[PDB]
Design an enzyme around this catalytic site. Sequence first.
Site, PDB file in Angstrom:
ATOM      1  N   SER B  26     -17.916   2.412 -40.824  1.00 18.64           N
ATOM      2  CA  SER B  26     -18.730   1.517 -41.837  1.00 18.64           C
ATOM      3  C   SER B  26     -19.166   0.409 -41.080  1.00 18.64           C
ATOM      4  O   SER B  26     -20.329   0.077 -41.712  1.00 18.64           O
ATOM      5  CB  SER B  26     -17.437   1.152 -42.694  1.00 18.64           C
ATOM      6  OG  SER B  26     -16.636   0.161 -42.188  1.00 18.64           O
ATOM      7  N   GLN B  27     -18.598  -0.119 -40.295  1.00 14.47           N
ATOM      8  CA  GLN B  27     -18.844  -1.253 -39.053  1.00 14.47           C
ATOM      9  C   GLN B  27     -20.330  -0.672 -38.414  1.00 14.47           C
ATOM     10  O   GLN B  27     -21.258  -1.400 -38.699  1.00 14.47           O
ATOM     11  CB  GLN B  27     -17.786  -1.641 -38.299  1.00 14.47           C
ATOM     12  CG  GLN B  27     -18.236  -2.893 -37.623  1.00 14.47           C
ATOM     13  CD  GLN B  27     -16.782  -3.598 -37.068  1.00 14.47           C
ATOM     14  OE1 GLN B  27     -16.354  -4.495 -37.669  1.00 14.47           O
ATOM     15  NE2 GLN B  27     -16.410  -3.050 -36.182  1.00 14.47           N
ATOM     16  N   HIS B 106     -15.367  -8.164 -32.036  1.00 17.14           N
ATOM     17  CA  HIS B 106     -14.059  -8.706 -32.146  1.00 17.14           C
ATOM     18  C   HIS B 106     -13.703  -8.881 -30.615  1.00 17.14           C
ATOM     19  O   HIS B 106     -13.964  -7.735 -29.842  1.00 17.14           O
ATOM     20  CB  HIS B 106     -12.960  -7.978 -32.873  1.00 17.14           C
ATOM     21  CG  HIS B 106     -11.598  -8.684 -32.695  1.00 17.14           C
ATOM     22  ND1 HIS B 106     -11.292 -10.041 -33.146  1.00 17.14           N
ATOM     23  CD2 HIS B 106     -10.360  -8.428 -32.092  1.00 17.14           C
ATOM     24  CE1 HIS B 106      -9.875 -10.300 -32.970  1.00 17.14           C
ATOM     25  NE2 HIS B 106      -9.493  -9.108 -32.358  1.00 17.14           N
ATOM     26  N   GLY B 132     -17.354  -3.348 -43.276  1.00 20.27           N
ATOM     27  CA  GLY B 132     -18.390  -2.828 -42.994  1.00 20.27           C
ATOM     28  C   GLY B 132     -19.428  -2.720 -44.383  1.00 20.27           C
ATOM     29  O   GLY B 132     -20.479  -2.786 -44.362  1.00 20.27           O
ATOM     30  N   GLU B 229      -0.496 -11.174 -60.364  1.00 17.49           N
ATOM     31  CA  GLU B 229      -1.615 -12.380 -60.610  1.00 17.49           C
ATOM     32  C   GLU B 229      -1.717 -13.097 -59.500  1.00 17.49           C
ATOM     33  O   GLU B 229      -2.422 -14.384 -59.532  1.00 17.49           O
ATOM     34  CB  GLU B 229      -0.171 -13.247 -61.578  1.00 17.49           C
ATOM     35  CG  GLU B 229      -0.129 -12.849 -62.719  1.00 17.49           C
ATOM     36  CD  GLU B 229       1.065 -13.358 -63.674  1.00 17.49           C
ATOM     37  OE1 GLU B 229       1.990 -13.016 -63.731  1.00 17.49           O
ATOM     38  OE2 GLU B 229       0.532 -14.438 -64.278  1.00 17.49           O
TER      39      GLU B 229
HETATM   40 MG   LIG Z   1       3.510 -17.605 -63.100  1.00 18.98          MG
END
Ligand SMILES: [Mg+2]
Lengths: 323, 324
Positions: B26-27, B106, B132, B229
């Site tokens: 992908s890179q 990197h 990528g 969440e």
């Molecule tokens: Mg909460």
Amino acid sequence: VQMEYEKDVKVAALDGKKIAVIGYGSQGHAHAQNLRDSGRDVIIGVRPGKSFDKAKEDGFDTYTVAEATKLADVIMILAPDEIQQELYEAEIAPNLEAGNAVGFAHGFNIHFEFIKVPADVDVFMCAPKGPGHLVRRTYEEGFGVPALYAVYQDATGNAKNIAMDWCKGVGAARVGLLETTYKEETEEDLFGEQAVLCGGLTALIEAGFEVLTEAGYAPELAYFEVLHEMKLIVDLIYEGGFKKMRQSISNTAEYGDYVSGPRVITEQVKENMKAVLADIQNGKFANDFVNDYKAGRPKLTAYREQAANLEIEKVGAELRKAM
Amino acid sequence: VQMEYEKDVKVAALDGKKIAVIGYGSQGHAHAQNLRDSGRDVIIGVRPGKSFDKAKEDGFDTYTVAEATKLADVIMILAPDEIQQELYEAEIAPNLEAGNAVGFAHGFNIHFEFIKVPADVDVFMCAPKGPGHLVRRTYEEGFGVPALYAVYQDATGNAKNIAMDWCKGVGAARVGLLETTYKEETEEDLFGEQAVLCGGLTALIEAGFEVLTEAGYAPELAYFEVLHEMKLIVDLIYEGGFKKMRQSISNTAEYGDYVSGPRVITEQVKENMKAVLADIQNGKFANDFVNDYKAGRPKLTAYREQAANLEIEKVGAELRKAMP
Ligand SMILES: [Mg+2]
Ligand SMILES: NC(=O)c1ccc[n+]([C@@H]2O[C@H](COP(=O)([O-])OP(=O)(O)OC[C@H]3O[C@@H](n4cnc5c(N)ncnc54)[C@H](OP(=O)(O)O)[C@@H]3O)[C@@H](O)[C@H]2O)c1
Ligand SMILES: [Mg+2]
């Protein structure tokens, strides 16, 4: 517990009910607007004037809290938790009738018994798992935010159906409902936001930022390394758990995750979390929060000013502007 | 350090350069495609296989690694940290010429000196802060992903301009560049993912899940309160810092954040992070990773199988199934 959807809402219990939404902030505007779009009869009760105005410009019949309550069969209280007790006693309680139903989106006041609703009035909850903008936006896109529902007291025998139909009316049943209790909702929700989602997370990020900047690394670069690049990681976890995230990052990163995560979050940190949970269960946190409000928010004042002055917040503001 | 953009790219140093991209994952795909649409001259080098023919079917003149390197002035190595050394010694090193430039995205192998490039060859870095597919897509949409750039050794005097023009070529300069060093890029990248983004975060979530479930709360509900969440919370911090996030959450949640965050992440946790940083700076982590890999990945194997057994992962897969 098993997830429920619109097919599981047996009875359209909000049918023929006059509904008052009290307040018009994060949750308030979202619940009222979604329920209105769902064909429910909704009015707003709120103090003057900057929530009052927006609500009347949005086309709602907007009354005082007392008036809205008197007109309504179902009253959903979406004022801030710290002011709900005083507001309930002065404006809501005198205007309830037997057979009414009172709702909340978080169980704080009812569970810790700052508010006690009369025995002939239902108390229910619909707790969406997101702030109002998301609750509203997802609804408008034909989608929704999952929600918990609960009943604290069922006077009429209709309280659970009112709760589930409220969930349906705001769009939550499109994506998933979970039944809980007022106790469980209140305690798990306070714990999650304190220990992990908000408290734990911001403190983790800040600690990482301090370690890097104190060690002499550039704060601009540190911002990316502990905050900016977090979104890609959490999106992966949201989509596919730790599993998908760890498949997607490099083996070097994955190995570091496995080795260093437990060095940072140790058994002592888990004990710290247990202490946080204890003060939720025993009412200490709740009393501290309400007492801070009653004293003029002095702790919240100092915390907010401290947070405004954080280097990561200054730097981040600058970088987000520069992008 | 100040963020830089296209106006700060002072020399179009890739002009007239033969560019080889090593790797077509992908890179590799992203860098190669982007540079091409930017008007640069790119060929691909990679072992025979799926990627080789996908490159050939993508319209790139495709060669082996050895022959792509032979033809190129600029050689960007976009392969996993763990295979770069073998690949470099066998296929790349014997095909370098004085004046060439070798690039990485990197700094691990160059910084920790698993790879040593001859001193008459430039070594540069362009490190986009995204995967990528995102580097490519943002470029296709007309912007990009921000990037760090660095130079480890400059033989020609052109290495920095090559790095910045590479950044420009892949679309990073459209959104923002920060100059760094190989050492700082490598150490900060390892530290961030270990102490905060990946290690700290998963361990924080898991501990929270354990506390709730051990206390008797339902695992399905706990999944939402410590994991599901988190996405909208981090989305808010990404968009507007702690400040925006804390405006959206209730005052109850915000107060809890201020009071309990410091009870969980204490001075001792910060000292733990300093120990993690120390093992990054002294080479111990790097050596441990490479040694595990050379040994057949036995620690990585045990860790992965343990992670597969986590209750939060089993409950979570079920719930995510239930929420299309
Ligand atoms: Mg909460
Ligand atoms: N915020 C979240 O993301 C979230 C998420 C889940 C659950 N909840 C829960 O939902 C409830 C409300 O949260 P929230 O974020 O919407 O609070 P909020 O943002 O502070 O909204 C408060 C609204 O009520 C108005 N208001 C203030 N005093 C009032 C009074 N005496 N009478 C009537 N209205 C008054 C406010 O108008 P003014 O602006 O003029 O003061 C404002 O519009 C809480 O129990 C919370 O736990 C919140
Ligand atoms: Mg909450």
